[PDB]
Amino acid sequence: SWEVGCGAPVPLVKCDENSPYRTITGDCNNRRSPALGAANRALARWLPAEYEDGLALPFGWTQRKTRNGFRVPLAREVSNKIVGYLDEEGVLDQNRSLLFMQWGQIVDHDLDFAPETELGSNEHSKTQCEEYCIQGDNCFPIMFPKNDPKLKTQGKCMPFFRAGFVCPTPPYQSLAREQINAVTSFLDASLVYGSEPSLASRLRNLSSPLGLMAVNQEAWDHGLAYLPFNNKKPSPCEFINTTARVPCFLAGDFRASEQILLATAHTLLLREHNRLARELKKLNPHWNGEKLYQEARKILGAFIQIITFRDYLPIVLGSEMQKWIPPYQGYNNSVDPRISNVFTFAFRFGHMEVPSTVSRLDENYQPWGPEAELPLHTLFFNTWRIIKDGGIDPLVRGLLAKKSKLMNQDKMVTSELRNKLFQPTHKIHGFDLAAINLQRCRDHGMPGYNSWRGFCGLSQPKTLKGLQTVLKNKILAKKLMDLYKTPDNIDIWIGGNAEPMVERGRVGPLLACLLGRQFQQIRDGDRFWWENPGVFTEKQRDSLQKVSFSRLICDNTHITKVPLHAFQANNYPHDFVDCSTVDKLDLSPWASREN
């Protein structure tokens, strides 16, 4: 028994139970427990942290200190030897649109962030990790292995800075290190509205009470809006093209301009807010700034939940779907809504669903222009290709008409992300998201692959032959064995993803367990789950049941041809239909039954 919460950042918790709306921070969702699921708290531990020194040192930190008697392979080496591949041909998912990937990142960003430590934004110390490759205090560089091509063109490591952790932050050493979650655990649309009341207000268009979200004043998208620019210099988005000089956007989530399609989806979501809001005033003139804001917010959340839970989850989890997430029975205030530390790694499967290129398509779903298809790496923190190069519409057409990468055991993560990732305050397009997941796994004190197979009630292979059988691959298992020398040491990110898919899923059984549990927990433990009676009306819930991503495009872009089932592989024109024939969101039940 160590205590009941460790809090020095528990920065004003006065509870109003009496609300028809969520807080911004997530506080006061569980009334019996007010801080459960709020942002700025520790990620839940489903299993105890496993650090090198028991407390907060990652496995791999001290050269001579092993895990279960072996050295841990270098993140980058696992990435070269197992994660890499060259041939992009035949890697596409024939049953998933590119929107299946992108929705995944939307939801992941609504659910969790564990951002790098904040005890250094303008010091030597920062560039000391990029420049000198010195394992330090929160600097934990990713070292290149003997044979690595990057040694020839980049230096000795990739810079990497340990995730933040709760309570102290300037010097710490007493209980087990627990990483923070800076977003709300609830599927709430916090990526559109922010998780802090500070940021939540800054994004609002206060200058008039129409419950509108603050839009971009310097540019437009033919009559349609953009997110406002974040004006913080220096700017990663300005850095990628000094001539076009377009900054990153300002969203309720800071990751929004990471890659162009993320920024597109975010863009659609704000347009829905405002659309929704305006349709409301054209119903209710009585309402003031808040009631319109909050009431569209509330609708934005439910749509997020319905799309994720009705359209998205069933094709991630497949046969395992109703096993982990059975039909809803209502809010269970005994359920734990917090995101587990492990989930923030399990949902990284999405990393293998990302293809090497992104296309703009025109009105006929043909190759927009002479640069239709762009390599993914040029789109990190790329906001200029939207504003100065077409709007979001051809990219959205892409999202429908194009396919996600299918995860593949001999072809795991495209080199766009594996060799050419762009990171802010780093000058080069040369990072490795895989190596970085793996460093991160260890950073976060993740129990290895068998602790999680155990936790999921699954077999624990102890030998190569064991692993071949589970992974159903003789080759991969062997390389995993050579690198790790016990399946107890396999990093959860790589072992869960190496597993073969379940029937009509896109993850293997261990991930479906980790994912399934977590999504069940975010539905059941949520007082404001759209389907929890008391949140909307019999009638309000009947309109909601009509919302489709297809519709969201229709009413928020100048696209007018869309498929029914946005998430599967859809080819023009045999799978498309007009905006016309697509059930819209009938907003009447939100008409004030008051004068």
Instruction: Report whether 113 contacts 183 (CB < 8 A).
Output: yes
- Per-residue x/- marks for ligand NAG, 96-115, CB under 6 A? --------------------
Answer for which of 165, 287, 347, 530 binds ligand HEM (CB under 6 A) is: 347
Q: Does position 108 bind Ca ion by CB under 5 A?
A: no
Residue 351 marked as a ligand binder: yes
The residue among 186 and 519 lying less far from Ca ion, judged by its C-beta, is 186
Which span (135-143, 200-208, 447-455, 463-471) binds ligand NAG, by CB under 6 A?
200-208
Answer for which of 181, 184, 518, 570 binds Ca ion (CB under 5 A) is: 184
Instruction: Report whether 173 contacts 121 (CB < 8 A).
Output: no
Tell me the C-alpha distance between 141 and 160, whole Å. Answer: 5
Answer for which of 80, 257, 344, 521 binds ligand HEM (CB under 6 A) is: 344
Q: Where are the alpha helices (DSSP H) in 156-196?
A: 190-193
Taking phi over 0 as left and psi of -120 to 50 as alpha, with beta for the rest, 373 belongs to: beta
Answer for which of 6, 175, 176, 315 binds ligand NAG (CB under 6 A) is: 315
Answer for which of 353, 393, 526, 531 binds ligand HEM (CB under 6 A) is: 353
Which span (107-115, 244-252, 283-291, 533-541) binds ligand HEM, by CB under 6 A?
107-115
Residue 233 neighbours by CB under 8 Å, 6+ apart: none
Please give the backbone phi and psi of residue 67, each rounded to the nearest 5 degrees, phi first: -115, 125
The DSSP bridge partners found for residue 330 are none
Q: Does position 214 bind ligand NAG by CB under 6 A?
A: yes
Whether 286 is catalytic:
no
Q: Where are the alpha helices (DSSP H) in 112-219?
A: 124-132, 190-193, 197-202
Interacting partner of 110 out of ligand HEM, ligand NAG, Ca ion, none (Cβ under 5 to 8 A depending on kind): Ca ion
Handedness of CA 567, 570, 572, 573 (dihedral sign): negative
Pick out residues in 232-261 that bind ligand HEM (CB under 6 A): 258-259
Residue 190 marked as a ligand binder: yes
The DSSP bridge partners found for residue 67 are 70
- At 549 the three-state DSSP class reads helix
Kindly report the number of other CB atoms within 10 A of residue 77's CB atom.
18
The residue among 181 and 570 lying less far from Ca ion, judged by its C-beta, is 181
Interacting partner of 244 out of ligand NAG, Ca ion, ligand HEM, none (Cβ under 5 to 8 A depending on kind): ligand NAG
- Rounded to the nearest 10 degrees, what angle do helices 260-281 and 289-306 cross at? 130
**Where is 305: in which H helix or E strand?**
helix 289-306
Pick out residues in 372-401 that bind ligand NAG (CB under 6 A): 384, 388
The DSSP bridge partners found for residue 367 are 361
Residues in contact with ligand HEM by CB under 6 A are 101, 104-105, 108, 112-114, 258-259, 344, 347-348, 350-351, 353-354, 380, 433, 436, 440
Q: Where in the sequence numbering do the catalytic residues fall?
A: 109
Residues in contact with Ca ion by CB under 5 A are 110, 184, 186, 188, 190
Q: Which amino acids are annotated as binding site for heme b, given as ranges?
A: 108, 258, 351
